[PDB]
Structure 1
Amino acid sequence: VKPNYALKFTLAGHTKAVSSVKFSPNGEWLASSSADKLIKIWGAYDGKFEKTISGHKLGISDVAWSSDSNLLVSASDDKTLKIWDVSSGKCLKTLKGHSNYVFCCNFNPQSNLIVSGSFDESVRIWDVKTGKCLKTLPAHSDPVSAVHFNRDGSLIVSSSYDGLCRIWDTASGQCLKTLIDDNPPVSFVKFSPNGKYILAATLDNTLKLWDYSKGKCLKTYTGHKNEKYCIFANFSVTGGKWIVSGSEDNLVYIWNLQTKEIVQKLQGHTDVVISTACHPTENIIASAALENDKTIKLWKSDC
């Protein structure tokens, strides 16, 4: 069984490179962040442009939704993160503390906390309600490329250009694990929906499925191009069990999680596919491309 992802909608509006696309947990919306300093909201099923959210002084590298789908958090080159009330478009808080580009961000499941990663080499844990930085983790010795909470928010996984993936205890801020045959820059990391595995991408055209407890590599996925960009990868769980990733050859790659075989390549983009997202309940992939393309694509499969 292979998926049958076909193009349904192309979403144009950003005037500079799109950096990140994320589906709201309620499945109604898609949020996009761009180098044009804007956040855009789009209908998840019809690609219908909804609204623009502005405020950042420089471009945005990442965006994430709260669990109730009411708030967004964005990570900007302006060295801040901003918390937004989606319906009103208001900026609730400006998160200050990072001394360089804020690259990545995520809410925890309870959505009372925000995790962020920066070029300043740190991981920061923020209180949503107050906007205060609760902890600064001396995480890495190079830019932090990704940050993600596990299923119950008790763990944080971070990745960096230093070649490491680190597992952190949310409550204490203590480093619980360091994942090390070589150390190529780690451009992306995230926990599996069950929280037992971590999917990590490295700038050597390789994606790896790790078992965090045992520190063992279970699966390796290749065939795509990834040597310069921090491309988002995902676990597609609505139909068949796939690994979805963007690629520097302008394609969306889909692998069978178990066999590691490429099951689909999506053609359509005209620049690096920097970001992909999988809909929480429907077999829908959102993809986003860089400066020379500027569009977002919505693809759907029967399985």
Structure 2
Amino acid sequence: VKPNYALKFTLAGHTKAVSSVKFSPNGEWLASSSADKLIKIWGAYDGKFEKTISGHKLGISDVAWSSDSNLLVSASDDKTLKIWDVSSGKCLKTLKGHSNYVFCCNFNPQSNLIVSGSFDESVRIWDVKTGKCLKTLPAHSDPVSAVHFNRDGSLIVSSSYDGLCRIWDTASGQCLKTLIDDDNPPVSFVKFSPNGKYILAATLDNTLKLWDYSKGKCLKTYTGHKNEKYCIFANFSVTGGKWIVSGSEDNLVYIWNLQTKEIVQKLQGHTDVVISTACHPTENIIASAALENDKTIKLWKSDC
């Protein structure tokens, strides 16, 4: 059955470009981060204007929660990660040590370790309950566009502008594998499949590839969208059908079929590049955020 994405609520109130959105591990709240230095909370079905968080001096590129949906880690253009008490917005800790912008950040399933990628051209393993930096991995020869943790937490997947997707052993820090396409276009986003066997990865020649990363082969490649300059965060969809969703640089959000690479559904409406999208853990909900010419979030619900 093909989806029926229906625009439900639109969220405005961001001073500048908004760069990252996420649903709660519970899915009652939508957390957004903006180049406006702000992190904001909204009603994850109704889109209600919740609290708004503050303390980062520069812009924020991305925002992740922990397993219990109790702390966010924002990654800011002020070289800083900060852990926030969602309940109050009182910044729990300010992780420090990167040399340049920090663009990607995430936790592990046990909501204790931080993974950050940065323009300092490194990745870093942090300790959430103390904020100390455990590991500096000279990850790539360039700025690091995404960092993700698998359903257990013994592997780090990293993206880089150098076309190098990469997989890391957390408990040791060793470089387990090293993906390369035969060509070397940059990779702007990466994450694990919810089942852990596979890896979504976006590249800037309008490409979005699914990978089985231990056999080292590309098992499918979805295209049609526009991705040449910006690092759009793409997602899977295993709630109803098994889909692939990703914003784009013609201010649309494209959806393909996970297992047949075909352009199942399209969602227009934004005014600028759609930079972020997430999908609710439980429900069939799509979030989407765009840059300064839009500065808004928008919600889509599908029956499947």
Give the TM-score normalised by structure 2.
0.99
Note the alpha carbon deviations across 1:38-83, whole angstroms, 9 max, x for none. Answer: 0000110000010110000000000001110011000001001000
Structure-2 separation of matches of 1:182 and 1:24: 37
How many angstroms does 1:6 deviate by? 1.0
Structure-1 separation of matches of 2:220 and 2:150: 20
Aligned-partner SS, 2:158: strand
Structure-1 separation of matches of 2:228 and 2:150: 27
Note the alpha carbon deviations across 1:222-277, whole angstroms, 9 max, x for none. Answer: 01000000000000111010000000000111100011000111011010000000
Structure-1 separation of matches of 2:49 and 2:142: 37
Structure-1 residue corresponding to 2:252: 251
Structure-1 separation of matches of 2:102 and 2:112: 20
Note the alpha carbon deviations across 1:132-169, whole angstroms, 9 max, x for none. Answer: 00111110000000000001011110000011011000
Equivalences for residues 276-295 of structure 1 within 5 A: 276-295=277-296
Aligned-partner SS, 1:121: coil
Structure-1 separation of matches of 2:23 and 2:221: 26
How many angstroms does 1:23 deviate by? 0.3
Structure-2 separation of matches of 1:36 and 1:204: 29
Structure-2 residue corresponding to 1:262: 263
Aligned-partner SS, 2:146: strand
Structure-2 separation of matches of 1:153 and 1:2: 34
Structure-2 separation of matches of 1:95 and 1:13: 28
Note the alpha carbon deviations across 1:173-213, whole angstroms, 9 max, x for none. Answer: 00000001211011000000010000000010000000011
Note the alpha carbon deviations across 1:78-114, whole angstroms, 9 max, x for none. Answer: 0010000000110010010000000100011001101
Structure-1 separation of matches of 2:138 and 2:174: 10
Structure-2 separation of matches of 1:43 and 1:140: 38
Structure-1 separation of matches of 2:170 and 2:111: 13
Structure-1 residue corresponding to 2:232: 231
Structure-2 separation of matches of 1:129 and 1:65: 14
Structure-1 residue corresponding to 2:212: 211
Structure-1 residue corresponding to 2:135: 135
Aligned-partner SS, 2:145: strand
RMSD: 0.5
Structure-2 separation of matches of 1:222 and 1:240: 19
- Give the percent of matched residue pairs that are identical in Structure 1 and Structure 2: 100
Give the TM-score normalised by structure 1.
0.99
How many angstroms does 1:18 deviate by? 0.4
Structure-2 separation of matches of 1:29 and 1:65: 11
Structure-1 separation of matches of 2:17 and 2:112: 30
How many angstroms does 1:286 deviate by? 0.5
| Structure 2 unaligned residues grouped into runs of 5+ | none
Structure-1 separation of matches of 2:224 and 2:33: 27
| Structure 1 unaligned residues grouped into runs of 5+ | none
Aligned-partner SS, 2:277: strand
How many angstroms does 1:298 deviate by? 0.5
Structure-2 residue corresponding to 1:81: 81
Structure-2 separation of matches of 1:141 and 1:267: 36
Aligned-partner SS, 1:167: strand
How many angstroms does 1:2 deviate by? 1.0
